[PDB]
Symmetry: C3
Subunit: 149 residues, 3 copies
Amino acid sequence: HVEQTYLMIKPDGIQRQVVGEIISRFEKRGYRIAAMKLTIATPAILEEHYAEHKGKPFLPGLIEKMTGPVLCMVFEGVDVIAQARKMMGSTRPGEAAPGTIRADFCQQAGRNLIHGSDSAESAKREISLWFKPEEIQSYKLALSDYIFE
Amino acid sequence: HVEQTYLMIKPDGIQRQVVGEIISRFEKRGYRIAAMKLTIATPAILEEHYAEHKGKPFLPGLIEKMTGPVLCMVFEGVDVIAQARKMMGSTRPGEAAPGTIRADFCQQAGRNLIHGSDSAESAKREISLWFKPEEIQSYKLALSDYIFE
Amino acid sequence: HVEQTYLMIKPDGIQRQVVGEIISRFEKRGYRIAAMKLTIATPAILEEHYAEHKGKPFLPGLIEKMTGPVLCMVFEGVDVIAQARKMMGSTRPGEAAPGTIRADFCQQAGRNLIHGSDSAESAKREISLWFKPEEIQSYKLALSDYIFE
Ligand SMILES: Nc1ncnc2c1ncn2[C@@H]1O[C@H](COP(=O)(O)OP(=O)(O)NP(=O)(O)O)[C@@H](O)[C@H]1O
Ligand SMILES: Nc1nc2c(ncn2[C@@H]2O[C@H](COP(=O)(O)OP(=O)(O)O)[C@@H](O)[C@H]2O)c(=O)[nH]1
Ligand SMILES: Nc1nc2c(ncn2[C@@H]2O[C@H](COP(=O)(O)OP(=O)(O)O)[C@@H](O)[C@H]2O)c(=O)[nH]1
Ligand SMILES: [Mg+2]
Ligand SMILES: [Mg+2]
Ligand SMILES: [Mg+2]
């Protein structure tokens, strides 16, 4: 049984030109690209994306940092929501484990390269926010017999 | 004082075409390739390899998944039995530490890319099962003075 | 607020020809190269460098193993003293976390590839020992807005 998670490369990932390296880490585990789109995030969509932080003092500066080019992604795999969070590492790069994206690429939480859904409910909500159903692509990986039990 | 461990790239490592990447991880630490052989694992040899699991319900499907091309390897180094196990990571990739082979490449225990001996006794048994003595090569690494104390 | 740490590639890092790989790991986090110099370490300077270890049983052999080409480096970043130590990993490569330099490249404490300052005080002292102030270069990284909060 597979699930789908929402992963988003933030503007610092675009501007530091590590998009391909990020994608390769997820492809390396046999996770399937189910959707992908480059866009420029707007405050209106970011307010909904970060609805959990509404009213908090840091929300205006988070939205400002995120107003820029982003790569919206959906990846599919076993336990991929929790696993992608593990691969990303802790919010604060200095506390993230070696070998995670944030530890390997970043210094501070405010520029930590990538977002990933933190739960099944948030993944469903975030995928629906950033993608229309017609943009989610269903196909089978040819190596499936060697990736899955 | 060095020891030798038996490492085997399973059919998923061959079919996903990551053999060279796996070998490079062990070469990177200055471990010496003492033996290397491509073969196709058969049920009779796999029954002896997995003798500890005889009779268990999961063994038949394990043998089926392992019936395929494998790369038999012997690596030599300080504490290499335990260290190779650490490098592979937990049997279940989702529990494996970031930076390990199974965490970086895999999703499920039944397709977890690689086997390594779990003890000195199993290394001796497994090397004897999969290799003839003529296939174990004795030579010295030229960089030894910069690898070992 | 950024700080500066002293990092030194030991003779095993030079001789195994992994200098570039080491530098890339620090550049990948947006750490800035503030100083860099190839020299051959001599006992007199190494005695001052390792002054804290005076009298310990491994010191004479440590000085012998360190008498050779070294790459002196200063890197700048947020919390870079502690973070570089985390990236290097434990003194013993066998205890170091997967994904650290020592775990990925080495086997034994006596050949563990790299030195890094362990504190703000030792970083100040080591930078002054190996570099004159005129050798420390100040410039701003063009991607600073995407590395720092
Ligand atoms: N619950 C399970 N479900 C699926 N496959 C399993 C399970 N438990 C074990 N396996 C498979 O059987 C192998 C042998 O189990 P075990 O010897 O306990 O793990 P290991 O030593 O980490 N791996 P191996 O290289 O096969 O010896 C595992 O590597 C998996 O490929
Ligand atoms: N500067 C700064 N940014 C933060 C802090 N906490 C969170 N953020 C930013 O806000 C984003 C969303 O916060 P959160 O959902 O709690 O963290 P995440 O799930 O790891 O992305 C993070 O990824 C960070 O970029 C903080 O303490 N300082
Ligand atoms: N052979 C050997 N070398 C050691 C030992 N302890 C320390 N060293 C070496 O001495 C160096 C400096 O020691 P220390 O400052 O404690 O370790 P570091 O801060 O991790 O570099 C280490 O990096 C090792 O190369 C030991 O027990 N045996
Ligand atoms: Mg979050
Ligand atoms: Mg076993
Ligand atoms: Mg020290």
